[PDB]
Amino acid sequence: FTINAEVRKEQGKGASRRLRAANKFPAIIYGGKEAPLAIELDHDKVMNMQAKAEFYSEVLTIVVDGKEIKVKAQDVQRHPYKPKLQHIDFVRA
Amino acid sequence: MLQPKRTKFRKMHKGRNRGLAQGTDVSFGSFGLKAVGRGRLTARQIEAARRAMTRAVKRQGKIWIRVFPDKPITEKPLAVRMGKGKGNVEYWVALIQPGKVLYEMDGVPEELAREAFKLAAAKLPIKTTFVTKTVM
Amino acid sequence: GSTRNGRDSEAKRLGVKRFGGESVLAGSIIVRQRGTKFHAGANVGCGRDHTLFAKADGKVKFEVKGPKNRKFISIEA
RNA sequence: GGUUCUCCCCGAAAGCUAUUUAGGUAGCGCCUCGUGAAUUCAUCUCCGGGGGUAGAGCACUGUUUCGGCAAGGGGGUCAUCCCGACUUACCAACCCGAUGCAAACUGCGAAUACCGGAGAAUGUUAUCACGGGAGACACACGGCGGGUGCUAACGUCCGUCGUGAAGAGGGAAACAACCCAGACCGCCAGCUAAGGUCCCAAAGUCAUGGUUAAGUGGGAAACGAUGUGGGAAGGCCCAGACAGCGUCGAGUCGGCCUGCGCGGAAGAU
RNA sequence: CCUCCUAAAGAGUAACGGAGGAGCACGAAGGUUGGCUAAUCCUGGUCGGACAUCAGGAGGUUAGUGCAAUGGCAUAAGCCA
RNA sequence: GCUCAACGGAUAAAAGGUACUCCGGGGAUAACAGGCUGAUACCGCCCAAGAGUUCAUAUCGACGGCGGUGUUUGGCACCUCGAUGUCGGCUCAUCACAUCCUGGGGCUGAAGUAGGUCCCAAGGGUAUGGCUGUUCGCCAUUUAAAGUGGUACGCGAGCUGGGUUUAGAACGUCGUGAGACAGUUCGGUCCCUAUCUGCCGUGGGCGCUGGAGAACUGAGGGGGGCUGCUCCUAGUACGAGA
RNA sequence: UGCCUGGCGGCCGUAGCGCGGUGGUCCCACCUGACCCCAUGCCGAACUCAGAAGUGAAACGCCGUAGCGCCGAUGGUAGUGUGGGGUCUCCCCAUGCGAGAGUAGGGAACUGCCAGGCA
Numbered sequence A: 001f002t003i004n005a006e007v008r009k010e011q012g013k014g015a016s017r018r019l020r021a022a023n024k025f026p027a028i029i030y031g032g033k034e035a036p037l038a039i040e041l042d043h044d045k046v047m048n049m050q051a052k053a054e055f056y057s058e059v060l061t062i063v064v065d066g067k068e069i070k071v072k073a074q075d076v077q078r079h080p081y082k083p084k085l086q087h088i089d090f091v092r093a
Numbered sequence B: 001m002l003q004p005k006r007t008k009f010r011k012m013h014k015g016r017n018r019g020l021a022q023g024t025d026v027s028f029g030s031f032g033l034k035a036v037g038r039g040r041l042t043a044r045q046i047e048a049a050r051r052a053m054t055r056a057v058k059r060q061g062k063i064w065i066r067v068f069p070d071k072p073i074t075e076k077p078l079a080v081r082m083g084k085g086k087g088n089v090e091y092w093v094a095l096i097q098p099g100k101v102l103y104e105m106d107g108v109p110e111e112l113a114r115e116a117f118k119l120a121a122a123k124l125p126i127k128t129t130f131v132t133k134t135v136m
Numbered sequence C: 001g002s003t004r005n006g007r008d009s010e011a012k013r014l015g016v017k018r019f020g021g022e023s024v025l026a027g028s029i030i031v032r033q034r035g036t037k038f039h040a041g042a043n044v045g046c047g048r049d050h051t052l053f054a055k056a057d058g059k060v061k062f063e064v065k066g067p068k069n070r071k072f073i074s075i076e077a
Numbered sequence D: 001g002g003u004u005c006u007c008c009c010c011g012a013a014a015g016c017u018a019u020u021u022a023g024g025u026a027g028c029g030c031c032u033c034g035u036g037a038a039u040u041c042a043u044c045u046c047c048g049g050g051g052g053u054a055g056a057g058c059a060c061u062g063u064u065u066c067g068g069c070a071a072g073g074g075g076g077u078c079a080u081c082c083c084g085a086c087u088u089a090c091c092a093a094c095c096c097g098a099u100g101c102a103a104a105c106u107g108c109g110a111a112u113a114c115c116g117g118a119g120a121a122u123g124u125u126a127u128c129a130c131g132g133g134a135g136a137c138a139c140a141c142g143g144c145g146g147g148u149g150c151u152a153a154c155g156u157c158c159g160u161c162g163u164g165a166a167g168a169g170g171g172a173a174a175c176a177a178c179c180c181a182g183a184c185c186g187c188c189a190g191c192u193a194a195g196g197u198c199c200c201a202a203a204g205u206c207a208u209g210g211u212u213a214a215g216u217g218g219g220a221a222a223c224g225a226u227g228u229g230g231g232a233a234g235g236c237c238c239a240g241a242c243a244g245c246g247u248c249g250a251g252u253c254g255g256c257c258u259g260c261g262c263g264g265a266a267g268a269u
Numbered sequence E: 001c002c003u004c005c006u007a008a009a010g011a012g013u014a015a016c017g018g019a020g021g022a023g024c025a026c027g028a029a030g031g032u033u034g035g036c037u038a039a040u041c042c043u044g045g046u047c048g049g050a051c052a053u054c055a056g057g058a059g060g061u062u063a064g065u066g067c068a069a070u071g072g073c074a075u076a077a078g079c080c081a
Numbered sequence F: 001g002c003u004c005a006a007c008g009g010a011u012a013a014a015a016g017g018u019a020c021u022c023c024g025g026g027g028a029u030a031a032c033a034g035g036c037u038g039a040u041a042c043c044g045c046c047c048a049a050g051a052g053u054u055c056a057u058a059u060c061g062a063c064g065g066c067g068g069u070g071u072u073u074g075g076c077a078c079c080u081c082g083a084u085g086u087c088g089g090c091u092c093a094u095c096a097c098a099u100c101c102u103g104g105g106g107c108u109g110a111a112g113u114a115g116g117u118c119c120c121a122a123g124g125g126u127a128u129g130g131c132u133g134u135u136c137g138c139c140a141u142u143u144a145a146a147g148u149g150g151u152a153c154g155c156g157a158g159c160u161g162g163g164u165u166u167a168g169a170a171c172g173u174c175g176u177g178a179g180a181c182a183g184u185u186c187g188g189u190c191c192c193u194a195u196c197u198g199c200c201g202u203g204g205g206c207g208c209u210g211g212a213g214a215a216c217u218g219a220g221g222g223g224g225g226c227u228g229c230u231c232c233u234a235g236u237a238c239g240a241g242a
Numbered sequence G: 001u002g003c004c005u006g007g008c009g010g011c012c013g014u015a016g017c018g019c020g021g022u023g024g025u026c027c028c029a030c031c032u033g034a035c036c037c038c039a040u041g042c043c044g045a046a047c048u049c050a051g052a053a054g055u056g057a058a059a060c061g062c063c064g065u066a067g068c069g070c071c072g073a074u075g076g077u078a079g080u081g082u083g084g085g086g087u088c089u090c091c092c093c094a095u096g097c098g099a100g101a102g103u104a105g106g107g108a109a110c111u112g113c114c115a116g117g118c119a
C-alpha cells in the first residue's frame, strides 16, 4: 500500500475538524529516533484500503514530501458511529 | 428483563445524556448492532429486541448484550400533585450515546446476523446500524 | 404523601482561608478541615479540630513532601 | 382604597437571617445624601495558590456482561457398620483476561471561577469606613448548569448571567421578559445595527454558480419509496453483459456516503 | 442539631429533593511516657465443627476508631501497659 | 432549675363548633369554565411472534417501537373572588369528520344473499317509551340509520329547577358535646323595560349626474338536496340445495 | 582520588517488587551466654546486659536481569471560557485553554554530610 500525505500546517481541534470537514483526516508518524511527523491523509483513499486486513499487518509506504516512509498501522481512531476514520498512528518501520 | 440485583441507592437524579459512547467496537462476537441515536433503552425494549434476534437465529450462534439497564426511572402515580417526595421506581433504563454497541452476535452468517438485527432494531427507540468486527 | 428525608446540617465554611503566597499574621487560620487533608509544616500549628494556623508572620507555602506525598502548609517567615 | 403644583441629579429590591413568621416586621444586602481616607477598587497581562466539577477511568465502594480456571455446593445411581467412587439439563465464589455503568465510586483530571502578589493603561473614587434619609424582603421570562416533574407545563425549586420590573426607539405580522439598541431638547441633513430590499411597504424583480418541482419553502416521528442532485468504490460486460424473445450489440447491476424533495399528515365560526 | 449528595473543582446555595444520624458516653474511653500493629485466607494441629485457641506462611489496613456519615489516622488519631 | 423539641424560647396557666353566622382582604389561593401541558385517555401508524386446514399481513396482531388529537382522568395556578350562574331536561342550534344511514370504491378466508375490512365522501338524514334528577345505562318496541365529537362539558339578561348547595326536620353513623358525613331522607323565593354588537323583519335619507313612469339583466346571496317498502326484470344470474 | 561499610538527611516508585548472582579484613547481621542492669499479661522471641568461638544460612548491602509496579511523549479524542449558529432533550462554527485513557518510548534511581575499612 502507498499512501500520499502532506505535512499538517495546523494542529489541534479546530484544524483537525476542518480537515475532516473536507474529506481528509490527520495522522501521525512516530517511532525510531526521528521526531514525530504530523500528516494529513485523503479519507476515501485510506478508508478503501484499510477495508483489507493486509493494511494493518503489512508495512505501508507514506509518500509525504515526495519521501518514502515505511510504516506499520499502529492505532486507528474510528468515527463513533459513521464508517469513517478520525486518525491513524503510524510507527516508522 | 435485566435489572441490577442490588444497588447502593434506590433512586437516581435524572441527569443528562451527553457525549459519545464508550464500547464502540465489536469486542466479543463477529457482528454488532450499534446505536446511531441518543436515548434511553428500557429493560423491556432490551428484552423485546433480544427475543426478536434470538428467534431469528433459531437458537444458533451466540448473543451478547453489551448494555445493561442500571438507571432507575421513577414516576409519580396518576392524580397526585407535584412534590411530596420523589416518585417510585417503575422501570430501569440504559443510557445510550451514539456509537454504543448494543448487541453482538457470532456463529451465524452475516446475512442472518443482518436480518436478526433488523428484526431487533424495529423494537428499539433509537436509530441503529449493523457493524462488523474490525482488525483494529 | 410524606417523605423520611428533609434534613441537612449547617455548612461548616471549611476550606482554605489563605492561599499560597498570601502574607499572614501569626495566629491566622490558613485552612479549616476535617482531619489532616493538609498537614502542618514549618511555622504552622495544628489545632484540636485540625485547623492549620500560622505560628509566625510570613507567607503561606503549600508543598507536597515525604514518602506518602502528603500536602503540607508552611509559613515562610 | 385614596393621597392634589413644577423642574433638575442619583436610583433600588423582590435576597439572606430571624420571627405564632410566611401578603407583616427587624438586622444585614441593594438605593440616596453627607463626611473622611489609602492606587482603595475594576479590566488586562504576568506570577504564586488550593481545588475534585466537566471529561475520563474502573485500583477502591457498588453495579454489569462474556470467556477461562475451579475451591466448593446442590440434583442422583452404585455402595451403605464406617466409608468411598464414578457422575451431572447442572447452580457456582475466588482468581485471571476481556466490556460497560455511578449524585451520595476516584490509583486521574481540565476549562472557568475564586484568593493573593506585581505591573501598565483606562475609569467623574468606580473602593472602604462612619453618619442623615429610605425603599425592599409577591418577582417574571430568556440563556447556561442542575434538583423535581414526563429532560411535560407560560410548572416548580436552586445557582449564574441577561432583559423586563423601573426602558422608550428599530426588528421578530400583532407579541413586558427574544434580537438590535439605552430616548436632555430641536432639525423636512447624513451613516449604520438587528432585520431587510416583487406589490401592500423604505431599499437589488442585483450579479455569478448550484439545488428544489414539493407552493417544499410556509407544522409533525418511527418507518416506507426505481423522486432528484453530488461523491467515493465495486460486481458483470463486444471470450456479447442487463432486459425481452442460442439471438441481441451496449452497457448493466445494487450496496455505500451525502444535498434537496415525497408519503407517513384527521378537528371543530 | 450533625454527616453525605444535590452544590455547577474557594465559601455559600432551594424544594413536602435523595440518604442516614444526635438530644450522649467516658476519672478513663482524659494527660503523658514506653511499647505494639490490622482484616481475611492458605497449610498443620486434642476435643473443635464453616467459624474458638495454638503454630507457620500468604496478605498489607481490604482492619480499627464508644455511637451516623464524611474527611482523617502508621510519627498512628488504631492496640497494650 | 426548661422535650420552653413550634428547639431566637408570645402566658406561670388554654380545647372545640358554626349550614345561624359576620367583617376586612385575595384571583397572592381552591371549587366552574378558559389557558399551558398531554403523563393518562382516545385515534393512527411501524416491526411481525403467532392465530387463521396449509398461509404473518382476508380477518386478527404477542413482545416492543413511532406519532396524532385536545378528547377523558389529571398536572399547573396564568385570567376572573369590588361575582365569569353551575348538573340534567326544555327551546333553539352551529361546526368538525375519526361516517351511524344513504352515495362511490379496493381487498376478502367475496358463489348468491348477506357480511368482514380498508379507502373516498359531511349533501341530506340520523326513534319513541318504562325506570331513574340523571347525562349515561339497562329494558320494551321501532328505524335506512338511531353516528362520534367541538361550541363557557353550546344555549337560565331564553324556560325549568328534579339534582347539587343556606336556613327546618329525621334516620344510620361519628362525636362527652356544640355539631358533622363527597351517607340517606321529607320540605325549601331562579330578578332585569335591551344602549351597543349581533340577528330577524320593516321603513326614512341621500346617492347612482336633467327629471319621471315602468320592464329587466344577474355580479352576488340564500333555500332545497333524507329515505322505506312492494312489484316487474326474475324465481333469472349464482347455488348441491337452502 | 577510587572501592566497600555504617549513621543521618535530601528526594518520595524512572527510586518499588520479583527473579539470578554476590560480600564477611572492616563494618553489619545472625550469633554466644545471662548471678548481673533491665525484660516476658508465659517465654532472654522481643527489650536488656556481659561477650566474640562460629556463619553469611537468614537478613542486609551491592550487582545483573523487564515478568511486573512505576514514569511517559507526539498526534488525535473528550471537556470547556468568550462570541456566534442549528434541526436546540443535543450539537455545530470562530477563537483561546485542552484532558483522561491509550500508543511510541523511558525505566533495575540519583544525591549531601560525617565516620570507619581497604586500595
Ligand SMILES: C=C[C@]1(C)C[C@@H](OC(=O)CS[C@H]2C[C@H]3CC[C@@H](C2)N3C)[C@]2(C)[C@H](C)CC[C@]3(CCC(=O)[C@H]32)[C@@H](C)[C@@H]1O
Pocket: F031, F032, F083, F084, F085, F086, F165
Ligand atoms: C356565587 C357564585 C356564582 C353564582 C356560582 C359559582 O358557584 C360557586 O361559587 C359554588 S359555591 C355556592 C355559590 C352560591 C352562593 C352561595 C352558595 C355556594 N351558592 C348559592 C360558579 C358555578 C363557579 C363554581 C365559580 C365561578 C362562578 C362564575 C361562573 C360559574 O360557573 C360560577 C361564580 C363567580 C358565580 O357568580
Ligand SMILES: [K+]
Pocket: C017, C018, C028, C029, C030
Ligand atoms: K486567616
Ligand SMILES: [K+]
Pocket: D026
Ligand atoms: K429587613
Ligand SMILES: [K+]
Pocket: none
Ligand atoms: K446610608
Ligand SMILES: [K+]
Pocket: none
Ligand atoms: K435562570
Ligand SMILES: [K+]
Pocket: none
Ligand atoms: K436596564
Ligand SMILES: [K+]
Pocket: D215, D218
Ligand atoms: K406553501
Ligand SMILES: [K+]
Pocket: none
Ligand atoms: K491515658
Ligand SMILES: [K+]
Pocket: F006
Ligand atoms: K417557634
Ligand SMILES: [K+]
Pocket: none
Ligand atoms: K372559637
Ligand SMILES: [K+]
Pocket: F044, F045, F067
Ligand atoms: K398515524
Ligand SMILES: [K+]
Pocket: F055
Ligand atoms: K394467506
Ligand SMILES: [K+]
Pocket: F080, F081
Ligand atoms: K371568583
Ligand SMILES: [K+]
Pocket: none
Ligand atoms: K352538536
Ligand SMILES: [K+]
Pocket: none
Ligand atoms: K366493501
Ligand SMILES: [K+]
Pocket: F122, F123
Ligand atoms: K353528510
